[PDB]
């Protein structure tokens, strides 16, 4: 091929292959082409420079010249043809103003959020309301004592993180004023973060999942209660020696690379960060602890009125209206300060402002208590995905697969036992019974869809295996309903 189309480099035509993609960038000086990953740039930089300005040119050309902030109220702030368009949520201009008027949104009712003093108090109130089977309101815990939730010692901060994880460790970072996501080196984030005076752009990452880092995963953990109801945890138990061998002996082993990795996240944001309204993926519940700084959550109850508002807001092309202004006073304000812990069940629609440089440890989880709401949110996601194109990474990893395995490995067992024994399940296993009915109904839909128009890409679960699971499920459910026409 032509030599002007050779990196770079790398001195190759094709880059072996985070991912370079088949992506390139040309020097506006030496005019040669580089693979993106041979350019020296990090993904968050790909759109920043009008001029670039490779390594072989900088000591004599100067550092790359970045676009002029021509329109700070647009996501494309660098674009002149957008100077005249409206103010977008939450661009630099929008946030700037919002920081001053934001305090007018109402506090929540006691029916929506329950603020307790510590983990012990939480437990009481929690049980009062039916525990996790009947978990519908968010809780804010002013002190973590009594939650049995491992957290590092304060004074612990961003530095220890980039040291434990490594400085080259890349993480999906939100370019705030641009309301987009790009990979950034932990070390590169630390630099920008530590420069408190010069922040031409703001960054906030929420997606540093460390469950797989032998050090980190030991330093910050979910509350005991979260672990006890986590469906992911139940399917991929942290087990060893004979327990693990047994797990293998029963065909109950699942690969670690199939595990939804979402229960252990570190988050860090620059002052001024705003994350726009969303529901957490898969309708997952959240634990969220402030190690440093402060967050302001703007929240709305998982009602059908609110969902319908949210779905329309999410599918409309409008970009200039805060969802709070169309929500008919559904949005409430809750401030979370250093050392305080938020616990959000399935459904809650929320946005968050970061008043102050921050560091947080949190995680997402699925539990049977919120099965129905979890499926409701899944329907909400899928309906939005029909109108708007998004990346699967912003959705719950292996949602369906998880449910396929939970039925096969957990539920399918219990039902069969009762069917062999007595045994009407509504006696000490009612919760289990209803969970099954719900799970199967949704699963029959997936099976239906899969059958009406084909399976996804290659893997993971073959159609015939889903059916064989289903065949088994229908039988035992069919069989159990009978038992429920005597007892």
């Amino acid at each position: 091929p032509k030599e002007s189309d050779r990196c770079g480099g790398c001195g190759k035509f094709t880059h072996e292959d985070k991912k370079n993609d088949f992506q390139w960038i040309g020097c506006d000086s030496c005019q040669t082409w580089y693979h993106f990953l041979c350019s020296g740039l990090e993904q968050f930089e790909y759109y920043l420079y009008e001029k670039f300005f490779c390594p072989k040119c900088v000591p004599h050309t100067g550092h790359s010249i970045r676009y002029k902030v021509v329109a700070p109220h647009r996501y494309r702030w660098y674009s002149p043809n957008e100077k005249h368009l409206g103010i977008e949520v939450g661009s630099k201009t929008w946030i700037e103003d919002f920081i001053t008027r934001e305090n007018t949104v109402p506090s929540p009712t006691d029916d929506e959020v329950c603020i307790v003093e510590d983990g012990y108090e939480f437990r009481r109130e929690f049980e009062k309301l039916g525990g996790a089977d009947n978990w519908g309101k968010v809780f804010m815990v002013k002190d973590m004592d009594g939650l049995n939730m491992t957290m590092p010692k304060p004074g612990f901060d961003l530095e220890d993180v980039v040291k434990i994880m490594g400085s080259d460790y890349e993480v999906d970072t939100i370019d705030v004023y641009n309301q987009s996501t790009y990979s950034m080196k932990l070390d590169t984030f630390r630099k920008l973060f530590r420069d408190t005076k010069n922040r031409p752009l703001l960054y906030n990452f929420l997606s540093l999942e460390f469950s797989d880092n032998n050090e980190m995963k030991e330093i910050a953990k979910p509350p005991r209660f979260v672990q006890e109801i986590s469906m992911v945890n139940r399917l991929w138990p942290d087990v060893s020696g004979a327990e693990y061998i047994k797990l293998l002996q029963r065909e109950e082993y699942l690969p670690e690379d199939q595990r939804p990795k979402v229960e252990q996240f570190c988050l860090a944001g620059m002052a001024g960060s705003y994350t726009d309204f969303h529901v957490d993926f898969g309708g997952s519940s959240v634990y969220y602890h402030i190690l440093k700084g402060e967050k302001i959550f703007y929240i709305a109850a998982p009602t059908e009125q609110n969902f319908a508002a949210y779905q329309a807001h999410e599918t409309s092309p409008d970009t200039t209206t805060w969802f709070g202004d169309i929500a008919n006073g559904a949005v409430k304000r809750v401030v979370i300060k250093e050392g305080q812990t938020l616990l959000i069940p399935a459904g809650w629609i929320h946005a968050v402002l970061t008043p102050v440089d921050s560091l947080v440890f949190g995680g997402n989880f699925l539990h049977l208590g919120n099965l129905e709401m979890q499926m409701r949110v899944y329907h909400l996601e899928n309906a939005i995905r029909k109108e708007i194109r998004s990346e699967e990474k912003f959705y719950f990893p292996n949602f369906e697969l998880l449910h396929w395995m939970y039925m096969r490995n957990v539920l399918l067992e219990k039902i069969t036992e009762a069917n062999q024994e007595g045994s009407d399940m509504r006696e000490q296993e009612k919760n289990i019974w209803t969970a099954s009915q719900i799970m199967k109904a949704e699963m029959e839909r997936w099976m239906d869809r899969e059958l009406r128009l084909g399976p996804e890409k290659n893997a993971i679960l073959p159609t015939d295996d889903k059916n064989k699971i289903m065949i088994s499920v229908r039988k035992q459910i069919e069989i159990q309903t009978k038992i429920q026409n005597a007892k």
């Binding site: 993609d21 088949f22 992506q23 390139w24 960038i25 040309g26 506006d28 082409w33 993106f36 790909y46 759109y47 920043l48 420079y49 009008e50 001029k51 670039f52």
Partner: peptide, 6 residues
């Protein structure tokens, strides 16, 4: 910046 995709 002038970029490209193959």
């Amino acid at each position: 910046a002038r970029t490209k995709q193959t």
